[PDB]
């Protein structure tokens, strides 16, 4: 016979590239947007604004 | 010479018929109701309610 070795996802090493979180009703609340922005820094330059 | 009480029989029959209305449910909302997954918080949502 052969057995089937099966393989975990976070025990590999590319996990630590994206984040995995389980989010139950995505399936429902996914009909519209969400929609977050992140961020943009800024560098205060001399002059009046 | 009198006159006796008389009455008559009536035979009647039952005509048969029948109604039917229907609905359905979305399948992103079928486990968000009776899935006994949701642990902690999402049993008292906003989308489950």
């Given at each position: 016979c052969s057995t089937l070795s099966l393989v975990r996802f976070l025990e590999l090493g590319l996990s630590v590239a994206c984040v995995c979180t389980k989010f139950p009703e995505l399936s429902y609340v996914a009909e519209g947007t969400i929609q977050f922005e992140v961020q943009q820094p800024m560098i205060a330059r001399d002059g009046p604004h | 010479?009198?006159?006796?009480?008389?009455?008559?029989?009536?035979?009647?029959?039952?005509?048969?018929?029948?109604?039917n209305a229907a609905f359905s449910i979305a399948v992103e909302a079928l486990g968000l109701i009776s899935g006994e997954n949701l642990d902690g918080t999402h049993i008292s949502s906003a989308m489950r309610l």
């Amino acid at each position: 016979c052969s057995t089937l070795s099966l393989v975990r996802f976070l025990e590999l090493g590319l996990s630590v590239a994206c984040v995995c979180t389980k989010f139950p009703e995505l399936s429902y609340v996914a009909e519209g947007t969400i929609q977050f922005e992140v961020q943009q820094p800024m560098i205060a330059r001399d002059g009046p604004h | 010479p009198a006159d006796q009480p008389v009455h008559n029989y009536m035979i009647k029959r039952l005509d048969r018929r029948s109604l039917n209305a229907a609905f359905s449910i979305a399948v992103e909302a079928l486990g968000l109701i009776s899935g006994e997954n949701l642990d902690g918080t999402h049993i008292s949502s906003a989308m489950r309610l």
